[PDB]
Symmetry: C3
Subunit: 159 residues, 3 copies
């Protein structure tokens, strides 16, 4: 038994029109998220946290621009594939915690469904998955409504 820590961080800019996808959940909003991907900043930060704990340790690094298959690419696919590769190295899940940093939209109603998705994608109990949100009280690029940031931490177990 041995435990390993990981940390992830991601940002996307608002652009065009909604909805956005956060933690796998389609959330109504006036603006959309600019990206190659989903624009799922929650699942990107989480993915990086998991890869970092297993020392693998980018999504850039274990997917270099394939591009495409990949416009509106499903970030849940990225998450599950990253997870397969982490498990092949012998790791199992301790727990994850995710912090969405956004002035808006309101994340709280969608968090239980985010957790369902993440727990499915990682093959764990929901009690191993926490998600929260915070505003930056109108400060910074998140505060001015210019984009959304997310942080994530992960704990991994190896037999």
């Amino acid at each position: 038994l041995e435990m390993r820590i990981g940390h992830g961080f991601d940002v996307h800019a608002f652009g065009g029109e909604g909805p956005i996808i956060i933690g796998g959940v389609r959330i109504p909003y006036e603006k959309g998220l600019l990206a190659h991907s989903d624009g799922d900043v929650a699942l990107h930060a989480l993915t990086d946290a998991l890869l970092g704990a297993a020392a693998l340790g980018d999504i850039g690094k274990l997917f270099p621009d394939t591009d495409p298959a990949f416009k509106g690419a499903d970030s849940r696919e990225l998450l599950r594939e990253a997870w397969r590769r982490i498990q092949a190295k012998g790791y199992t899940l301790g727990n994850v915690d995710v912090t969405i940093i956004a002035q808006a939209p309101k994340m709280l109603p969608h968090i239980p469904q985010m957790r369902v998705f993440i727990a499915e994608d990682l093959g764990c109990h929901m009690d191993d998955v926490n998600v929260k949100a915070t505003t930056t009280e109108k400060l910074g690029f998140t505060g001015r409504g210019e984009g959304i940031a997310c942080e994530a931490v992960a704990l991994l177990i190896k037999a």
Copy 2:
């Protein structure tokens, strides 16, 4: 024995006049912190880290706007209550680490008293509580003196 990780992040804007309260400590400063609460960004980030490790996992989520009891609400009360609920789920403390992000005021002289407070409120040794500060070298909303940010991580143990 099982260990669990949590992460917290908070921001408050400066507004009106001092002092501010950070980690429970009254710190002299030209501006105050705008909020419902203390405006304790250190103890809010910590509280979220502890709740996230126990998967509980917002302060919004286990206190929805009561509001009030709550103008100038004591963030130490929030911390202790969050802690009671975490312990009722069977968790004990591993350790916590807190990073205050502020251009000013200087946090270093007040850190030992912050640690006394936090350790009391969590019923642990002081060696289980670390607090630090950093500036952003005049960059961003913290750098321009517009507000204060804080990050926190926590490790939890379950029997």
Copy 3:
């Protein structure tokens, strides 16, 4: 056996001309990093994460402005000294994960050499050291090319 968590965060502003030093690696770039030090924001964030896990828990706190010895001070020296002191308290390394937040320059080619340096300086295997990079998609002070930020987490073991 007991595990301990730490978190670090650092920022430096661009100023004058390159190169910069990140994770010990000299990276060509049009601007340099303003500081007393290296300006190594990666190794500063890491150092703080390690000190925070051992509750020690600033680089300000266990080096107050000596200043100098210290213009263009080698951040790897700071890292190794912080590490000596952490080991003297009885801690050994679990693992570390580092997240460089920069719009530019590109970090990916230099990451393997960063890991060599960090692993040498901490006397561990390279599999215990992860480093990644992310942009903020043109948002915030990192996005406008005004500076570089870095986050780090660390897991410590005590016999």
